[PDB]
Amino acid sequence: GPRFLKVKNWETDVVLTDTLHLKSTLETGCTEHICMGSIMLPSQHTRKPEDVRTKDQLFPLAKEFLDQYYSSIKRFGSKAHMDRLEEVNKEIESTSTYQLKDTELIYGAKHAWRNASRCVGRIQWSKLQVFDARDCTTAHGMFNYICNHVKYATNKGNLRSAITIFPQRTDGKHDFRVWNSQLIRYAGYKQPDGSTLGDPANVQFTEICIQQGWKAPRGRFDVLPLLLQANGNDPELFQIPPELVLEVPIRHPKFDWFKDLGLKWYGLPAVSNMLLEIGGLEFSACPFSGWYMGTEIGVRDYCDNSRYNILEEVAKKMDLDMRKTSSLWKDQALVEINIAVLYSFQSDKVTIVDHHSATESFIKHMENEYRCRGGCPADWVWIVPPMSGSITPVFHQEMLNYRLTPSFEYQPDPWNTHVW
Amino acid sequence: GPRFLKVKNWETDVVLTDTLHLKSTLETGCTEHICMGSIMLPSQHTRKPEDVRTKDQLFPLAKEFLDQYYSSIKRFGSKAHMDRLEEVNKEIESTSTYQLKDTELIYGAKHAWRNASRCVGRIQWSKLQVFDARDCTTAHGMFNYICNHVKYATNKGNLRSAITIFPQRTDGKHDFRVWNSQLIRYAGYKQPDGSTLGDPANVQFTEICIQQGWKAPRGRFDVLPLLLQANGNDPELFQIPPELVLEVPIRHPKFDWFKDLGLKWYGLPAVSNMLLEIGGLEFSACPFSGWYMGTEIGVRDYCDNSRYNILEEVAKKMDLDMRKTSSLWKDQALVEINIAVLYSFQSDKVTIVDHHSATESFIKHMENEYRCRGGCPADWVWIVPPMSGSITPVFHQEMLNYRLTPSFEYQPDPWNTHVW
Ligand code: HEM
Ligand code: HEM
Numbered sequence: 098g099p100r101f102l103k104v105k106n107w108e109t110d111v112v113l114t115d116t117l118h119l120k121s122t123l124e125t126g127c128t129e130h131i132c133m134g135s136i137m138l139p140s141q142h143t144r145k146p147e148d149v150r151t152k153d154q155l156f157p158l159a160k161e162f163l164d165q166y167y168s169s170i171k172r173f174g175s176k177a178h179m180d181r182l183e184e185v186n187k188e189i190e191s192t193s194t195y196q197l198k199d200t201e202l203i204y205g206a207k208h209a210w211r212n213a214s215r216c217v218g219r220i221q222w223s224k225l226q227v228f229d230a231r232d233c234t235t236a237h238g239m240f241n242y243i244c245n246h247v248k249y250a251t252n253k254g255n256l257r258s259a260i261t262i263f264p265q266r267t268d269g270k271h272d273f274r275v276w277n278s279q280l281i282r283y284a285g286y287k288q289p290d291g292s293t294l295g296d297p298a299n300v301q302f303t304e305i306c307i308q309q310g311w312k313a314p315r316g317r318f319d320v321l322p323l324l325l326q327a328n329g330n331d332p333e334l335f336q337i338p339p340e341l342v343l344e345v346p347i348r349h350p351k352f353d354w355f356k357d358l359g360l361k362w363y364g365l366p367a368v369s370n371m372l373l374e375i376g377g378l379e380f381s382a383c384p385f386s387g388w389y390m391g392t393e394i395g396v397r398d399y400c401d402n403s404r405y406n407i408l409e410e411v412a413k414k415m416d417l418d419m420r421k422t423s424s425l426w427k428d429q430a431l432v433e434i435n436i437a438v439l440y441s442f443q444s445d446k447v448t449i450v451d452h453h454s455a456t457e458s459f460i461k462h463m464e465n466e467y468r469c470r471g472g473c474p475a476d477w478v479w480i481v482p483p484m485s486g487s488i489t490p491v492f493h494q495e496m497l498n499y500r501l502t503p504s505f506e507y508q509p510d511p512w513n514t515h516v517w
Numbered sequence: 518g519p520r521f522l523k524v525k526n527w528e529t530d531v532v533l534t535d536t537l538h539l540k541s542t543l544e545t546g547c548t549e550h551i552c553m554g555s556i557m558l559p560s561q562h563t564r565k566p567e568d569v570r571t572k573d574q575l576f577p578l579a580k581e582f583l584d585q586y587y588s589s590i591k592r593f594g595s596k597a598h599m600d601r602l603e604e605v606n607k608e609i610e611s612t613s614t615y616q617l618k619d620t621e622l623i624y625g626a627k628h629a630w631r632n633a634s635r636c637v638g639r640i641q642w643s644k645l646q647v648f649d650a651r652d653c654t655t656a657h658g659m660f661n662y663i664c665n666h667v668k669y670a671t672n673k674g675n676l677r678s679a680i681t682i683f684p685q686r687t688d689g690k691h692d693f694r695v696w697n698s699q700l701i702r703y704a705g706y707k708q709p710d711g712s713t714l715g716d717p718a719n720v721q722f723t724e725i726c727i728q729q730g731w732k733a734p735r736g737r738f739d740v741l742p743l744l745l746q747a748n749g750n751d752p753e754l755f756q757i758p759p760e761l762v763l764e765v766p767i768r769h770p771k772f773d774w775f776k777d778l779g780l781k782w783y784g785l786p787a788v789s790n791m792l793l794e795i796g797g798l799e800f801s802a803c804p805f806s807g808w809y810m811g812t813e814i815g816v817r818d819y820c821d822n823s824r825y826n827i828l829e830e831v832a833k834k835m836d837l838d839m840r841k842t843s844s845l846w847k848d849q850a851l852v853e854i855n856i857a858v859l860y861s862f863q864s865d866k867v868t869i870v871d872h873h874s875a876t877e878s879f880i881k882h883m884e885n886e887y888r889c890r891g892g893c894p895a896d897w898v899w900i901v902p903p904m905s906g907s908i909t910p911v912f913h914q915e916m917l918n919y920r921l922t923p924s925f926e927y928q929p930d931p932w933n934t935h936v937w
């Protein structure tokens with residue numbers, strides 16, 4: 098179409114028409130001569146470590162959001178709409194910023210998720226619990242909110258999606274940041290013997306903690322301490338209450354020897370290093386959580402070469418023919434590890450979804466979004482699971498990727514800027 | 518870089534600099550606001566079913582190629598170069614087209630493959646056998662060349678890459694087309710009982726053949742007849758000599774019951790429906806072949822829902838728990854089917870490569886191409902295998918995709934145009 102883009106499913110031949118892309122103003126990183134679809138950080142809005150948006154750069158963005166928000170409730174042009182535009186406008190003029198009402202914040206958070214093109218679990222987007230932490234002023238206050246978020250979200254295993262929003266960035270005053278990449282994660286330690294204990298992905302953070310006084314248990318699965326930063330002040334260490342950290346011992350439903358591998362993982366995945374942008378406002382500390390898709394742990398966390406990298410050990414115990422890759426011993430061990438993960442979480446009755454169920458519901462979500470919103474931004478490279486790709490329905494689904502706002506963006510690691 | 522694009526491997530942290538993209542003039546389908554990286558046919562050059570390039574549209578393209586060809590041999594600007602440019606130019610003026618010398622044709626074919634961004638086996642690109650069939654004038658002549666190609670390429674199981682190039686398109690005279698999607702493929706028949714015998718992907722072609730007199734054996738693995746079109750004349754049916762069609766009975770190295778499934782596949786993959794473009798010239802009939810990557814058969818050909826779709830049967834025989842997707846019975850059966858395929862071809866000593874070995878050599882190829890050519894166009898969506906994606910090195914490799922020429926493009930199915 099000369100404006101209406103079509104995406105087809107090559108497995109079912111269903112074709113959809115996308116008009117929603119016409120509302121994108123942000124750049125993807127691609128040009129008519131080159132495609133950057135497989136670049137992790139095409140740095141098209143990875144949040145500038147620079148200053149902060151100015152009054153002139155903030156009102157247009159603030160206005161774009163309100164127009165969008167009010168059109169949502171079918172009140173575009175209303176007095177309320179125009180009244181609100183004048184308030185924010187006048188408010189930005191005097192304070193160089195503005196405050197979102199509670200309703201606009203909830204709408205913005207849900208849509209940041211709704212617009213997350215790399216997220217396969219968006220069918221859940223409208224069911225998000227928003228915790229307003231904008232009145233927080235210290236690291237102890239942040240610790241409290243986080244513990245409450247973790248308890249709520251965990252819900253004794255029956256996981257519930259949630260996000261806690263700390264004060265937005267200002268200019269000078271300074272901002273809030275959760276130095277951890279995820280609320281709950283395991284430490285990593287580079288052994289002197291060239292070995293690496295724990296999660297290799299968290300070695301640089303583990304060092305920051307240790308230097309701050311953390312008493313690393315020097316174990317394989319040590320839950321890291323929270324390193325919180327409020328109002329641009331130095332970060333502070335806090336130990337999330339163990340009773341609040343739900344974990345699952347990994348065992349196999351057929352291989353009794355699997356237990357002995359000593360594998361375990363935490364049940365609540367919670368991202369804490371991203372930035373939430375709503376109406377030109379930037380919320381640099383907005384930890385959010387949902388639940389795991391089995392492959393995140395079984396394929397990536399456990400089998401990534403630069404992660405726990407457990408394929409050999411498992412393969413050995415299975416007495417596999419690891420003399421040639423053609424035996425597919427890696428693939429075979431990979432399937433068992435993922436069967437163990439699902440079986441375990443399900444046994445402990447901790448919420449989790451397998452890549453088969455997760456991808457099918459995403460297709461349903463896409464069809465829903467095309468019907469009611471005119472489209473759905475999706476990043477194929479990220480939506481397709483790291484194992485058994487073509488046996489899942491998303492592999493055969495063409496997807497259009499574009500940037501819509503509100504949204505979640507990436508931001509510089511706090512220790513690569515924060516002074517002192 | 519303000520011109521030098523960088524691709525990184527997130528598993529090894531190696532970063533490469535791409536300058537080669539600066540030589541792309543063709544469009545990818547993406548824009549700064551939207552990415553079409555997962556669209557199968559972004560119709561950016563899927564060969565226009567229209568007329569044919571004119572003299573004015575042909576010389577610039579012819580010139581671009583020669584300049585490229587002569588720069589290859591480090592003779593840009595030479596007398597030979599300029600002499601050749603004037604010949605082709607003058608030749609296009611009188612005949613409205615031109616003829617590539619043997620050397621330019623071989624260089625062009627190898628580079629069409631070298632530039633194939635969706636191909637994971639390009640490390641082999643410089644080792645291609647080029648068969649010049651430009652003197653062919655009838656369907657019988659095409660049949661002969663094809664049989665010879667198949668015999669050469671097959672080489673009794675020790676497969677060798679090759680391509681046979683029939684006469685280029687002209688204007689009126691008319692062109693050559695191999696109506697088959699691949700030289701060797703199985704027929705498909707829609708059963709009256711809603712069933713579908715054979716390969717569902719080939720049902721429409723099987724009908725064309727049958728209507729042309731083909732005596733379909735109405736079996737599950739019936740090698741289709743060749744339907745050749747020379748000089749725009751109606752296509753003619755030919756039966757490739759069975760002794761020339763190498764096939765492999767699929768059996769498992771542990772499950773003796775696998776044999777009984779009656780699975781078999783042919784050893785030579787040969788694409789015959791694409792169009793080769795060199796110097797503005799279009800070779801609408803240029804069948805090419807190499808060898809299989811295990812997953813093409815085991816994952817896609819056998820397990821695609823719209824293909825043989827054999828996951829249940831296999832799963833049943835394995836006595837798997839197919840009551841819930843969480844058991845990963847599909848994944849488990851998928852690994853065994855692929856172990857069977859590799860084991861079988863290897864047993865019969867027919868060339869084949871597993872996704873692990875194939876993807877690692879592609880990484881090596883990429884590193885080679887960045888060193889000597891300044892880059893390598895790669896389509897991530899296609900390069901990453903349909904199973905166990907993240908355990909292969911290409912999954913963690915960022916790839917830049919752009920169109921370089923010479924190249925292989927798609928073209929309209931011959932029966933959707935050819936009259937009579
Ligand atoms: C309801 C359950 C949910 C599931 C199963 C789910 C699953 C996923 C998965 C598998 C990924 C890939 C993660 C990776 O590869 O590292 C992902 C990415 C993402 N999810 Fe979801 N998600 C859910 C809820 C949420 C929530 C509550 C939010 C936000 C409010 C969210 C925002 C995102 C974002 C921003 C990404 C992209 C991360 C990036 O770009 O680095 N997800 N999700
Ligand atoms: C030497 C062994 C080779 C291997 C293992 C290999 C493997 C592959 C694989 C796995 C695909 C995916 C096919 C699909 O998903 O349908 C592919 C695509 C492709 N290969 Fe190669 N290849 C090889 C040789 C060749 C040769 C000889 C040529 C041409 C001279 C070639 C040209 C291409 C092209 C054009 C595509 C893209 C197809 C499309 O866009 O639809 N390949 N190759």
Ligand SMILES: N=C(Nc1ccc(CCNCc2cccc(Cl)c2)cc1)c1cccs1
Pocket residue numbers: 137138366367368385386387388389390393507
């Ligand atoms: N299923 C989840 N897991 C999850 C989601 C997102 C991420 C973030 C992955 N970020 C990768 C990345 C890519 C590029 C640059 C950077 Cl800094 C980071 C991690 C786990 C959920 C997390 C919160 C809700 S669901």
Ligand SMILES: N=C(Nc1ccc(CCNCc2cccc(Cl)c2)cc1)c1cccs1
Pocket residue numbers: 557558786787788805806807808809810813927
């Ligand atoms: N390994 C091979 N297999 C193979 C390569 C390419 C194709 C072509 C796949 N085309 C898919 C497609 C995609 C979009 C539109 C159309 Cl018409 C067709 C098939 C098998 C080789 C074939 C020739 C040499 S290697």
Ligand SMILES: C[C@H](O)[C@H](O)[C@H]1CNc2nc(N)[nH]c(=O)c2N1
Pocket residue numbers: 135136137478479480527912913914915916
């Ligand atoms: C290089 C490539 O973009 C990178 O490895 C991507 C591929 N797809 C992914 N998909 C998900 N869900 N998560 C990831 O971290 C990645 N990594």
Ligand SMILES: C[C@H](O)[C@H](O)[C@H]1CNc2nc(N)[nH]c(=O)c2N1
Pocket residue numbers: 107492493494495496555556557898899900
């Ligand atoms: C929709 C999506 O682009 C499509 O299913 C692609 C994905 N990757 C692929 N990769 C290869 N090698 N072959 C294919 O046919 C496909 N299909």
Ligand SMILES: [Zn+2]
Pocket residue numbers: 127131132133134547551552553554
């Ligand atoms: Zn793109």
